[PDB]
Chain A
């Protein structure tokens, strides 16, 4: 009777001893949800960047685990609630290839306004930038057939472009950025942020951007505690 009580206390003590190491390793890693809109060719960048795949990387001795859902069905309003404690949802946008841009906008608007993902931040990578670049340079692969308000839109005097760019490619990229920032700023329900970028299979320093954006996310999460 008493010996079983003491052996149970000993077993619980050992269990707690191992749970402390587990808690030590768990707080050190940062889980990211890589959620591409689909058909985005993001397999190439997750290569350079069965139900669920996991990819580990390390920046400045900080460990990141990025998850990608594999063999999941089309509807996602139930299994996505598992990713509310994630530090960042990386959202890869297949900008040019079409109306997939409007589908990405609708998915982003649903994730932004969801009750449970209302506190999770989104790091926005507008992939396939050069495909869109040559598409708009050719003057044939137009997107204004899907976005009629593309005309009457002027690139601001701000928003420095790259010297290896054309004003029209910069125009299209900033049009997409403002289309996403409209949704991002129109809602204040959740204390979360959106970090829009530009990327392709040409820029290989996207993990540095993820690192800096997660650092800012954690800073603003800490800055919350000092208030009420």
Chain B
């Protein structure tokens, strides 16, 4: 039943590939996401509304 051991080989090399990647701390990436969500806080017409003089759907 080579149709199973071959797929298991592909799986184990795929895990070997996905295993060796350097990861940053979760707090660092969380701070990055927060910095992005606050450096664009005023460019979000859904978060903070815009005056009716620039709403195209009024």
Q: Do chains A and B touch in the complex (CB under 8 A)?
A: no
Binding site for B on A (CB under 8 A): none
